[PDB]
Amino acid sequence: QYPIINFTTAGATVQSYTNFIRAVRGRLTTGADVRHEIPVLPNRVGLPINQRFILVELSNHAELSVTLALDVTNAYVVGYRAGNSAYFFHPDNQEDAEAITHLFTDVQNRYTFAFGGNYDRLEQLAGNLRENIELGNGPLEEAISALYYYSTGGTQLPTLARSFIICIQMISEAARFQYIEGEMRTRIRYNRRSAPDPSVITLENSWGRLSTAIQESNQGAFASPIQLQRRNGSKFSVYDVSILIPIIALMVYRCAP
Numbered sequence: 001q002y003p004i005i006n007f008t009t010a011g012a013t014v015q016s017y018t019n020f021i022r023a024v025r026g027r028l029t030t031g032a033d034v035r036h037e038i039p040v041l042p043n044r045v046g047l048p049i050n051q052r053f054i055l056v057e058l059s060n061h062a063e064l065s066v067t068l069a070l071d072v073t074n075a076y077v078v079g080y081r082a083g084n085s086a087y088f089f090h091p092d093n094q095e096d097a098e099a100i101t102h103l104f105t106d107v108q109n110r111y112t113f114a115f116g117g118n119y120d121r122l123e124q125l126a127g128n129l130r131e132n133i134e135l136g137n138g139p140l141e142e143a144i145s146a147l148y149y150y151s152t153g154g155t156q157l158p159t160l161a162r163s164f165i166i167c168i169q170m171i172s173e174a175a176r177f178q179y180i181e182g183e184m185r186t187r188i189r190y191n192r193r194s195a196p197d198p199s200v201i202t203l204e205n206s207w208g209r210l211s212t213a214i215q216e217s218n219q220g221a222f223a224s225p226i227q228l229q230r231r232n233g234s235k236f237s238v239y240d241v242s243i244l245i246p247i248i249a250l251m252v253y254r255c256a257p
């Protein structure tokens with residue numbers, strides 16, 4: 001069975017969220033593969049199907065539960081289960097399509113969306129950009145209910161799309177970046193719901209390019225600079241892995257050590 005990590009919005013604390021994101025990172029990778037002091041996710045090539053996914057079970061005050069499936073090779077959400085129904089994003093290729101048949105195998109009802117799970121597609125379906133979608137314990141609670149009620153026709157597609165953007169950022173992007181984990185920790189600490197600032201959105205957008213730049217670096221110096229944003233939206237370039245060691249927690253595997 002794929003490992004299950006449990007999180008609840010009911011009485012969530014800085015501590016419970018900290019333990020959650022550290023457990024997710026611990027199941028995503030062994031941390032045996034480190035490049036320039038940043039851990040690498042397992043190589044898809046050589047990864048047995050029985051190690052391909054982890055399950056994150058989310059519960060809220062209404063004691064509704066949904067289970068997200070994360071791909072350990074990129075930490076991205078590929079689908080979810082709510083009771084007797086499972087839903088999957090459109091796989092990019094045949095290997096990925098066959099992989100998702102190994103998820104939620106006992107579920108009565110299985111559905112694959114025609115659309116992909118990327119931010120550009122989900123923002124379009126939601127009718128809202130990430131910069132206008134609030135994150136925090138309240139938004140996650142509402143997302144869990146929206147995901148749960150999709151199968152009974154209680155959630156419209158735009159609301160589902162928005163709920164996916166919330167879950168992806170507070171789980172996948174938080175696992176990928178200590179910096180985004182810290183943004184979610186602050187929102188919990190101060191009982192705040194608020195949209196992510198440009199620093200967060202640009203890091204999300206740049207994760208694949210940063211993984212490549214770090215792994216292809218000449219002893220930590222980037223072959224080419226990467227442009228990121230500060231909280232105030234001002235742009236700056238990174239030339240070196242060292243400045244990112246407090247920012248990025250996980251990278252997608254790009255090449256052999």
Ligand SMILES: Cc1cccc(C)c1-c1ccc(C(=O)O)s1
Pocket residue numbers: 199200203228229230231232238243244247
């Ligand atoms: C120091 C760094 C390196 C790489 C990427 C980012 C987003 C950052 C920032 C941390 C705090 C910032 C601020 O207060 O605007 S920016």
Ligand SMILES: [Zn+2]
Pocket residue numbers: 010011061
């Ligand atoms: Zn409560």
Ligand SMILES: [Zn+2]
Pocket residue numbers: 035036037219220
């Ligand atoms: Zn190095």
